[PDB]
């Protein structure tokens, strides 16, 4: 069995937030049934294609295990066609543009009536409050106003946006935990109920210690482990922080041998709180054990800098792979940079099912990120991405439309 | 009635950040969650970063609302009694303590399947168990390095990033909840608990899925024909820094505003959508453009994309970035102002919509929380204060079924 073994999905979502949740959905068991418009598909199929004439990666990525069907919901047949799997499924998602759904004569209030059990997730740029309601939202729209932005980079830069899709995986990963605790809830209701996730919403809870930190300077004017203290300025609001330790402890991006022209010749390095004398014994310091300056973090931290320029001299003698090998004898939090090189070839990576090769049709073997927990009950089968409309037929027939009726919809090009 | 987790029974040994915000939103979805602490010391979360001498630290009070607190040291005869009898009536046991710890303790996972074949075991660790690194301690920016965001963060002529947003850490906690749901729905079938592991570096490289679509593109082709560094720069081996561009979504850049020489946040994002390129054309007053072939597709932008990015800054920096947002996005331009963490702490709609809370904590007074993030329209959490260290330590050994004497007799042995 599988965790999600005999529930349906509707799966109405393109790009990556609405598509990242229900390719999770698959991979616990459901069947998902992507509804894709005719002779078009989900936008990702065309975007970034490194092979032409094929799904481009972005699509197989994000739609492994599903099924796709192509369908007009503005035909009459369409309507009626979505009818029917909104009463046949579990699940409902979609992450169209505000309104877009609703146009289609399907809001929340109409898919009650249809089915009361269905739970519907959607996914917007910006809750049903905001001032933002009817701004479209891609990644970086979601990190610039949730708050990771203004946050991330340097204190002399611009805001920055992280690779990580905080505005669109993130929230996808969010509606999921959602939709899962409504399939409990359900259990106890009978009933279904809708789930809305907002990408600004998935930011902000990822930058909760932000939020912490925000609160700190309200109250006090100073944020103690910021590099700004004690001898830089605070303003009114958290301020970027470059490479400083965050939620965990200080910390710094060191240069590591090849830096100058490998841009990934790095690590990351912590200087975890009980762990000095360690952190002292491994860059040959013995002297700065119990040296007041350096005993205690708040003591380091006014000259935090010139500790890492220090044990800088010692990481650009050797690699970053040595580096490490070496400094985590010491018990120090430390860890390569790693490119995504060196992610997509790691042999570990490949065991762990964290990094899986998957074949596709026509384009042959391509690596995707697998399913990130792990269950010792369970182990996810993770398959191609599906052709567009492949599954139509199977799926109109499954609804118990007869061939006349499907040649009617093809017609009629409601498929 | 009725909350989804209503009768489920949490056993949190969490600590930090990455546990905690897993077992909090238990707590909210109507989990009863029993955090267990070290005697006298509590979560290191309790003494870190206090802004108020002497009481819970903001760090504590923001991940664990609405949780029970007990003290109880499980390396003790006493101690270890209780938490095989904790595990016995519980639905889920979590745990982040660093590789090994628990498993020193006496109850294995192979040991709690025996005590309770129905518990599902959930594990954080900063690495996977046949990963190198499996034993390396990991905070936040550790796993960042590991999972590749450090790397593909930043400028192209500056250092690997780390992102203020927790990758490392409550993105972590969020992937383990994901696995606990999936295995208590799966629990419905089987009869059976689980193991559900996620690793720190695991969740910051899932968030990163798109940066290995990219790895892929440039194996096959040399070159990643959207990035900053097309035509114009160079490619090496592994997908570099961007800057401020488009990622997942289309191409963007970061915008000055007014104020920017003095205010760090007077700025946007501003998208240039490819399907909205007469719309931004209007906005910006370049109707000449429109159907320019230089400019008239996102392949004939890209080459000279930061002159475009350039001319719309003439327009941006003469107006505020509230200002310009509410101008532009009457042309449908997706943009957003950066908001700064004191916009979003005072932000009425944030309150509106639940995503910022203000509750009330004992000793301190109120206190902000991120809210429960997503939204149901069949139940909405009442998040609560956090608990004081050992507050609710007799209530859980009497519900346990503990006399007046054991429990005594454990307060004298520092097994509580
Ligand atoms: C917000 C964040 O999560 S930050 C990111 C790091 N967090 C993670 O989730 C990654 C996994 N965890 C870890 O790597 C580690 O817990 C770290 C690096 C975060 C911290 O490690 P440390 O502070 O050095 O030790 P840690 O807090 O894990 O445990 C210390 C000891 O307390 C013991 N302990 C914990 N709770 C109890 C208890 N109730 N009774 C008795 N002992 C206890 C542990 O078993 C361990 O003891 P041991 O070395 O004698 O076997
Ligand atoms: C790369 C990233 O950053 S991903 C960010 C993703 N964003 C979200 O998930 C939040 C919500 N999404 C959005 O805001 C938008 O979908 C955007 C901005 C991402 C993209 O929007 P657009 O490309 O302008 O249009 P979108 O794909 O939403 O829909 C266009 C039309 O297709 C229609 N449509 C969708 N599926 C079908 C179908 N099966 N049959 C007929 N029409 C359909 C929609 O109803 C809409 O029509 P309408 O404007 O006449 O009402
Ligand atoms: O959390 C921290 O960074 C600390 O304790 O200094
Ligand atoms: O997705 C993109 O960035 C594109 O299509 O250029």
Redesign the interface.
Known sequence: ?????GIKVLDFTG??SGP?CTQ?LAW?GADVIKIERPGVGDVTRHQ?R??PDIDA??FT??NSNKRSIELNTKTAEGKEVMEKLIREADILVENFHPGAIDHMGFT?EHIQEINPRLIFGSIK?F??????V????????????????????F?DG?????????????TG??????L??????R???G?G??????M?????????????????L???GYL??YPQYPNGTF???????????????P?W?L?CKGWET???A???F?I?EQNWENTCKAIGKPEWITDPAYSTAHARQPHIFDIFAEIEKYTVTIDKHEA?AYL?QF?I????????????LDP??R??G??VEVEQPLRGK????GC???????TPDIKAAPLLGEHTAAVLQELGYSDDEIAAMKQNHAI
């Open positions: 069995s599988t965790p999600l073994q790009v990556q990242s999770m616990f970034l490194d092979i990666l972005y990525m994000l929340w740029g809750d049903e409050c905001s001032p933002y009817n701004v479209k939202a891609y990644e970086n729209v979601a990190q610039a106003a949730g708050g990771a932005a203004s946050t991330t980079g204190w611009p805001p920055l946006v992280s690779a990580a899709a905080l505005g669109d995986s993130n990963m969010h509606l999921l935990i959602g899962l605790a409504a399939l409990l809830h259990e106890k209701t009933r109920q809708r789930v809305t996730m907002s600004q919403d998935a930011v902000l809870n990822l930058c909760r210690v932000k939020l912490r930190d925000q609160q700190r309200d109250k006090l103690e482990e303003g009114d609001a958290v301020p970027r922080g470059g490479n400083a330790g965050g939620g965990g402890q910390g991006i240069k490998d841009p990934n790095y690590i990351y912590t975890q490490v985590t018990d939090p430390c860890a390569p940079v790693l490119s995504m090189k060196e992610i997509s570990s990576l065991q762990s964290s990094v391509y690596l995707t990120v990130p927990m792990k269950f010792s009950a369970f």
